[PDB]
Design an enzyme around this catalytic site. Structure first.
Site, PDB file in Angstrom:
ATOM      1  N   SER A 161      35.785  61.810  46.186  1.00  0.00           N
ATOM      2  CA  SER A 161      36.216  62.766  45.168  1.00  0.00           C
ATOM      3  C   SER A 161      36.950  62.097  44.000  1.00  0.00           C
ATOM      4  O   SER A 161      36.361  61.290  43.289  1.00  0.00           O
ATOM      5  CB  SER A 161      37.103  63.838  45.813  1.00  0.00           C
ATOM      6  N   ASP A 220      30.667  62.427  48.061  1.00  0.00           N
ATOM      7  CA  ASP A 220      30.798  63.825  47.659  1.00  0.00           C
ATOM      8  C   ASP A 220      31.318  64.048  46.250  1.00  0.00           C
ATOM      9  O   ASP A 220      32.145  64.924  46.027  1.00  0.00           O
ATOM     10  CB  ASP A 220      31.694  64.581  48.644  1.00  0.00           C
ATOM     11  N   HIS A 226      36.093  69.267  53.251  1.00  0.00           N
ATOM     12  CA  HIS A 226      37.155  68.380  52.796  1.00  0.00           C
ATOM     13  C   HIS A 226      36.745  66.914  52.698  1.00  0.00           C
ATOM     14  O   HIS A 226      35.992  66.528  51.803  1.00  0.00           O
ATOM     15  CB  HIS A 226      38.377  68.519  53.708  1.00  0.00           C
TER      16      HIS A 226
END
Length: 294
Positions: free
Chosen positions: A118, A143, A267
């Protein structure tokens, strides 16, 4: 179940507080390390997390390929102490990463593969793109897809704002992080949560991510094409993100980066499924002959 805190030493061989003297003065960056040979995997955590989020991943990857690990607490996260903690611009954070590598190895740096999740993935790209790490041999984003990055972060804020504001103990923070569904993997939670909190003034969150929103545009704007332009082999791992954006789809058709799909995780997949991430990274490293299988 046992929710008591587990120290960094159960996963990393050593830790260091790297001194860096920059424009704003003298800062100190916390790094956790492991290994003696092979490429250094420089790991960059996501917003509100810390280098400890890579603890379980570290043990998993070390058991698959001969390599070294340097997990870095980015500015205003974990145990890192900077003079201007409010400045989380992509520019400043990328500069920090370069400065840390420079301070740690001087003129003789080992081969390095950047790996970021991220926010850390965006910082990883800005670092590689600005050629701040001379010995960089590879780049991996986990991600992180520009097209939906802002939406991914906004969907998180609702959860973030609703979390407890303090915890009686570190053990309770860990228990909450698991039972709330934030960190599915108990093993990872016991060691990583200490990096997400700090003692008040009881524990509280190390950082309020909402205060960094003014910097999100800088983190992600043009990130996909920025990633594609970096002149080194690249890896994109998808878990929580289910689609590429238009820019990456085009880049993929052009064969500009390796891509792998891992099990869904809202997450941090590196915390929830450490060995699946390690397996994917190991395969990539071996594929490009960057490291030897154990």
């Amino acid at each position: 179940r046992d929710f008591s805190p587990v120290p960094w030493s159960q996963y990393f061989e050593s830790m260091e507080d790297v001194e860096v003297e920059n424009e704003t003065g003298k800062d100190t960056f916390r790094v956790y390390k492991s290994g003696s040979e092979g490429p250094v995997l420089l790991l960059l955590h996501g917003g509100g997390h810390s280098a400890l989020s890579w603890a379980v991943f570290t043990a998993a990857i070390i058991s698959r390929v001969q390599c070294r690990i340097v997990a870095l607490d980015l500015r205003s996260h974990g145990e890192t102490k900077v003079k201007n903690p409010e400045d989380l611009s992509a520019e400043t954070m990328a500069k920090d990463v370069g400065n840390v590598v420079e301070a740690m190895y001087g003129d003789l740096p080992p081969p390095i593969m950047l790996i970021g999740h991220s926010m850390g993935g965006a910082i990883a790209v800005h670092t590689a793109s600005s050629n701040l790490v001379p010995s960089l041999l590879g780049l991996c984003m986990i991600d992180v897809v520009e097209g939906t990055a802002m939406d991914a972060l906004n969907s998180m804020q609702n959860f973030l704002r609703g979390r407890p504001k303090t915890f009686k103990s570190l053990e309770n923070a860990i228990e909450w992080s698991v039972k709330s569904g934030q960190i599915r993997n108990l093993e990872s939670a016991r060691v990583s949560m200490v990096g997400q909190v700090k003692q008040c003034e009881p524990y509280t969150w190390r950082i309020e991510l909402a205060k960094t929103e003014k910097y999100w545009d800088g983190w992600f704007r043009g990130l996909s094409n920025l990633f594609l332009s970096c002149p080194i082999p690249k890896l994109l791992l998808l878990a929580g993100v289910d689609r590429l954006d238009k820019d990456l789809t085009i880049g993929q058709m052009q064969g500009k980066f390796q891509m792998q799909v891992l099990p869904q995780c809202g997450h941090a997949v590196h915390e929830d499924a450490p060995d699946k991430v390690a397996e994917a990274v190991a395969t990539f490293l071996i594929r490009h002959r960057f490291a030897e299988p154990i």
